[PDB]
Design a protein around this ligand. Structure first.
Ligand SMILES: [Zn+2]
Lengths: 114, 65, 59
């Protein structure tokens, strides 16, 4: 049931719903709507798609100085090991972005060119 | 260094192969090719507890003096 | 492009994934050549029950 709902707006007062579900597995799922349809994206795909980085930056960004709390530490350990075990072939931003452009080509309707 | 059961490279900080799943004397990185540590690391271990929420009892309410 | 839609599907949902997988079990080829000639024989049984169409040109 644990979910971060957020309503991301643009400067023309349009918006877009973005939902973050906690899983019982170790991943965090992402809902976003598009043209009376939604999708589910693992969040570390989005994280390494924004910027090339290391996992230590993710550790320093989420939990910070709260390193004795081994609960969230083991959650993040689940997240990183499950991400780089489920698809270890993705090791920069460009591979993941072209993976996204292949997975999301025939619905945004820019397919014959871009 | 190692933080709990989490360790990364001292230069690139990438996630590494499990030292309790390797066969060699070192740990090879998933992106670079470096050797850290020499496998004589302080062993992978954590200390975890409960949260004083998941265990309900009237005996717990007796501790609310 | 239907296979590209299925590639977006298999990552996309769990209800539309199941719905279009049922549709793919529904999609599969409903005619083979031995079945074609057997259905030709069944259309000969439709000749037996040929309630004839109106001539739609002079009547
Ligand atoms: Zn490294």
């Amino acid at each position: 049931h644990y979910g971060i709902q957020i309503r991301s707006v643009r400067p023309d007062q349009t918006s877009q719903t973005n939902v973050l579900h906690y899983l019982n597995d170790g991943q965090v799922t992402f809902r976003f709507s598009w043209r009376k349809n939604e999708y589910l994206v693992p969040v570390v795909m989005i994280l390494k798609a924004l910027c090339h980085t290391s996992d230590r930056e993710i550790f320093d960004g989420i939990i910070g100085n709260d390193v004795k709390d081994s609960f969230l530490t083991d959650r993040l350990e689940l997240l990183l090991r499950g991400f780089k075990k489920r698809y270890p072939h993705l090791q920069n931003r460009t591979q993941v972005l072209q993976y996204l452009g292949d997975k999301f080509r025939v619905v945004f309707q820019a397919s014959p060119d871009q | 260094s190692v933080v709990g059961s989490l360790i990364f490279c001292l230069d690139c900080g990438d996630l590494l192969e499990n030292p309790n799943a390797v066969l060699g004397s070192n740990v090879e990185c998933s992106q670079c090719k470096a050797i850290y540590p020499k496998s004589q690391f302080s062993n992978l271990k954590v200390v975890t507890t409960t949260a004083d929420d998941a265990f309900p009892s009237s005996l717990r309410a007796k501790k609310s003096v | 492009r239907p296979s590209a839609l299925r590639n977006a599907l298999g990552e996309a949902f769990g209800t539309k994934k199941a719905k279009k997988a049922i549709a793919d079990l529904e999609r599969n080829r409903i005619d083979s050549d031995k079945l074609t000639d057997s259905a030709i024989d069944i259309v000969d049984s439709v000749r037996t029950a040929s309630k004839d169409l109106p001539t739609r040109a002079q009547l």
